[PDB]
Amino acid sequence: TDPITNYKPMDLQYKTYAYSMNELYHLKPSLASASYEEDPLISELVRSLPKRKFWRLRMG
């Protein structure tokens, strides 16, 4: 949580959505909360990710 983590440009002309790093951190899933787990869009998106073998972690 160094200063850059609160930085974000203000009064953007050509963009609508900007977030500082700490604002994005604040939206991360929290300890012991099922809001993400129970969200059916989130659940389906995670299920659409590749199986573990895809990443070829075994190659080191």
């Binding site: 160094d2 440009p9 959505y17 977030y19 969200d39 998106l45």
Partner: protein
């Protein structure tokens, strides 16, 4: 359960992976695929928490996170006239997971990009000589590149001794060093 109220991102983004080769006969095109696309903060977190962290990745693999209409290839029209700010981590002592995450947050958060967007995507490369972070820009406009590079330096928490190099895609010496 119920849907969370999502927080939109300014553009959609796609995560790509380059796999390491397992056979002498695999080409680059065989080794790269787009994995998943997203346009909310919450979808981003769910992806990041369910794919391997950087410290898990094998040698000669890459994560690429690019705007959904740009391929992570310099041939792409959006990249071909541009380049990348590059940083190499000589050493495994840095927390590559947090450096990568901070970079991603800065990118999807639109914090270090110019208002008139220059950033097309960002690439994590796992390499024997040392791992690399690359921030891909659409142009070589010097003044916008300097502001992006300085902010990238702050995101990565480098001291003056640590150096970012900008490489125009049309090659291999750097044209700017910070």
């Amino acid at each position: 359960g119920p849907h969370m109220v999502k927080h939109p991102l300014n553009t959609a983004w796609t995560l790509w992976y380059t796999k390491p080769a397992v056979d002498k006969s695999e080409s680059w095109s065989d080794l790269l695929r787009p994995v998943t696309s997203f346009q909310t903060v919450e979808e981003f977190w769910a992806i990041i928490q369910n794919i391997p962290e950087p410290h898990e990745l094998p040698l000669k693999s890459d994560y690429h996170v690019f705007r959904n209409d740009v391929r992570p290839e310099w041939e792409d029209e959006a990249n071909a006239k541009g380049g990348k700010w590059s940083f190499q981590l000589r050493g495994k002592g840095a927390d590559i997971d947090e450096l990568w995450l901070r970079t991603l947050l800065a990118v999807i958060g639109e914090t270090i990009d110019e208002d008139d967007s220059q950033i097309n995507g960002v690439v994590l490369s796992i390499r024997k000589g040392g791992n690399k972070f690359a921030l891909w820009t659409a142009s070589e406009d010097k003044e916008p590149l300097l502001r992006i590079g300085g902010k990238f330096k702050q995101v990565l928490a480098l001291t003056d001794d640590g150096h970012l190099e900008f490489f125009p895609h049309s090659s291999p010496q750097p044209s700017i060093t910070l």
